[PDB]
Amino acid sequence: PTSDDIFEREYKYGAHNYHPLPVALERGKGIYLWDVEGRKYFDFLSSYSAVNQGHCHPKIVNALKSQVDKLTLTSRAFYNNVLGEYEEYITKLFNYHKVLPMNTGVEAGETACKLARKWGYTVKGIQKYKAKIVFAAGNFWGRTLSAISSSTDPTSYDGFGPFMPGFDIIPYNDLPALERALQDPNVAAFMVEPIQGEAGVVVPDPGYLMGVRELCTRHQVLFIADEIQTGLARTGRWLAVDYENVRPDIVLLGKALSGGLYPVSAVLCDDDIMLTIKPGEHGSTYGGNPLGCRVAIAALEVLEEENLAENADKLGIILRNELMKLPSDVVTAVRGKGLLNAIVIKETKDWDAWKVCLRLRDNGLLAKPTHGDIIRFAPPLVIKEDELRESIEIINKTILSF
Amino acid sequence: PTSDDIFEREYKYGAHNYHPLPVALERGKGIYLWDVEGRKYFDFLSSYSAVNQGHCHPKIVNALKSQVDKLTLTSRAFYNNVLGEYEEYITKLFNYHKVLPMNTGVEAGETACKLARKWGYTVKGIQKYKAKIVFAAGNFWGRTLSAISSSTDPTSYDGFGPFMPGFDIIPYNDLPALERALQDPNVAAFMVEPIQGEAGVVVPDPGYLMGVRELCTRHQVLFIADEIQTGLARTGRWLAVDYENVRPDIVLLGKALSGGLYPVSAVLCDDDIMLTIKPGEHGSTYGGNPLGCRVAIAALEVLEEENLAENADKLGIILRNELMKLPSDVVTAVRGKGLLNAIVIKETKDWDAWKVCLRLRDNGLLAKPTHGDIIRFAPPLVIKEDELRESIEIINKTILSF
Ligand SMILES: *[C@@H](c1c(COP(=O)(O)O)cnc(C)c1O)[C@@H]1C[C@@H](C(=O)O)CC1=N
Ligand SMILES: Cc1ncc(COP(=O)(O)O)c(/C=C2\CC(C(=O)O)=CC2=N)c1O
């Protein structure tokens, strides 16, 4: 089974909704990935920041192994002995009254939208089905019809049919626009990434998140922080909103909540919001199952025990300082926080970000462009300074190779 | 670590979106569950048919244990060695050109709606954005904003903001209604469960599915079969539509696709539909990851080698025959196919379905009511005839003790 055999088999039998970088991995550990021919690569994508803990982290693997012989799925029609322990752990970790467990990032987002509308109708007092949710241009929170209904990316929404009403879009990093939107008392929530990941690591100006908090509070609007990609130590803090000391009304976690071992996502908020949803009014077959819950407890413990936020902070400072040494008639922008970083590749009609990632792959480093000309650099947070130095050398010699 | 500790902790720190049967499980094996006090129960819900293969089936556990050590998540920005093997396997198993992997059943349904809309615009010629999707009253396909927009159950949609446009609703088990609805040329698809599960195991009349297939073809409308619950041997066939030899345009699979070990779903269809979605136009972080694909291959293999379809066919006949022996004063209807079955209870001031289910629990059998008065009986398909008779005697004991 060769890489080309793998490419062709997927092309024949799988949908073509992805165009992946041509590399075929069969193993991963820590910061490293191996393809089927045995070549080794630095992972600088981390599955979009889902493997913050590194691939196949042994403590998470052992949690999964311990629970899978015991009990894996009851559905929430019954109780089991694991879900409560996890719920107590994660609500006490992030200091919210309650958690609503789901599986994928987009499901946590859908759940937040449902809580915001329910809260708007039953607490704020909006007349039924006039509630609005505001989003920021550039946002990505998944691919359901609701989620693409808030997207400004034509590839997400075009051809996918009438869109969800009550979803309004304002520019990112634009407080007066948010103030203007929040003039309308029918607005129930503003959902926003503290740093926009799929948009290309778009870091807003300092004080943006503080102003969001103050505007949402002043207008009695729920502040929903999507931290599915920025949370869990990726940017150098437990939540990226910790950089500004801001407390969202709802927090979304996913991705790294499981170390990549299991689709686990979380909706955290206080009772005044969460309990707007009554028994039978929301759910998911796999949401809150014992296996994902054991995996999630272990994944969070790893983030804490190994001090991965502080490592991400220090190493991100180093990586950004080395990337800013790149020439600028080639790299026109370097941005990021912690180990969520990007560069912007001045795309001639001679070379582009894709060619850059193909040559990075040839030199043993795996990264993928987004929105054409942006290259994200987002390695697992267990990377060491010497490993980061070697990877930076790969990046330098590749960029300069063009 | 008692049952009441468990109830109390979940009340404190978990969302209140379920009201579960008060039983606190900590182990499952095959058809059996054990609670934290050591009490043993027959599982007659099967996590809504996600554990068709029984709890903790060893072949699926070993598949998961074999992969969790190598590679669990690259995202589909890269290729991995497992996904294409699984795609070849499942597509040849069900005789469709391609599969689009997702994680949860609602995500497969959303994916199908997006396929149907995009096919309507790009193949059928419907003007953007006028494409409709027809659904049957009583349908249940998850809890996203889209899915509840097509629901006729007030508990799923009431209070949940404005609804998704372009969905029409007709009665179930009603070919003339479908015929009338498909006069509109802007209809792209009809999505329907071969047997409505959450609605209370509502079995359509013989020939309904043949007539659906005929009307969809006659009017150039996609037939989407949601077999997330009815598929994978549950009703005594690989797909419930196999009872009438009908081939939907799109098939949804979920739940038992992983034996309960991992959230895996799938959307199956031929090229002329599947390839209306181009690269970058749809995906999911965890969709198609190698861990889920290894468990899904093993879960399917279990269903084939242990002959669970024939088992559920024969044993479901035995179960329905014995449930029809119950008194028409208390049990007013019996229905089902294979091991997907339910009874309807005559509600009086001396018993209701919740009371019956609490007493079933006290007698060693776990079931949950749906829509008030319907009890579903759905044990794992690995159950044996003598175990099924023991369970039936627990049901007789319970019903006749009222
Ligand atoms: C994921 C993403 C989601 C959707 O999560 P899901 O894929 O488990 O449904 C929601 N919120 C955020 C902030 C993120 O990041 C990815 C973002 C994309 C990227 O290129 O960064 C691709 C996604 N799968
Ligand atoms: C036919 C069908 N289609 C889609 C979904 C959504 O799947 P999901 O929960 O997102 O994985 C389900 C799940 C159901 C049904 C159910 C009950 O009471 O029967 C409780 C669930 N959570 C389903 O049965």
Please give a structural write-up.
2 copies of one chain form a homodimer. The first copy, chain A, is of the alpha/beta class. Chain A folds into 2 domains: 1-56 and 307-402, no CATH class; 57-306, no CATH class. Chain A has 14 helices and 16 strands. The first copy, chain A, has helices spanning 3-13, 46-49, 58-68, 83-94, 105-124, 145-148, 154-157, 175-182, 208-218, 271-274, 290-305, 308-323, 353-362, 385-401; strands spanning 24-29, 32-35, 40-43, 79-80, 98-102, 132-136, 167-170, 187-192, 222-226, 250-253, 265-269, 331-337, 340-345, 365-366, 369-370, 374-377. The first copy, chain A, has a 7-stranded mixed β-sheet with strand order 5-11-10-9-8-6-7, sandwiched between helices. In chain A, strands 1-2-3-14 form a 4-stranded mixed β-sheet. A 4-stranded antiparallel β-sheet of chain A has the order 12-13-16-15. In chain A, strand 2 and strand 3 form a beta hairpin. The two termini of chain A are 33 Å apart. The interface between A and B is large, with 121 and 118 residues. The structure holds the ligand *[C@@H](c1c(COP(=O)(O)O)cnc(C)c1O)[C@@H]1C[C@@H](C(=O)O)CC1=N and the ligand Cc1ncc(COP(=O)(O)O)c(/C=C2\CC(C(=O)O)=CC2=N)c1O. Ligand X8B sits between chains B (48, 104-106, 109, 140-142, 193, 197-198, 226, 228-229, 254, 370) and A (283-286). Chains A, B: The modification N6-acetyllysine is found at residues 12, 29, 70, 325, 349, 355, 368, 384. Chains A, B: This is Ornithine aminotransferase, mitochondrial. Chains A, B: Homohexamer.
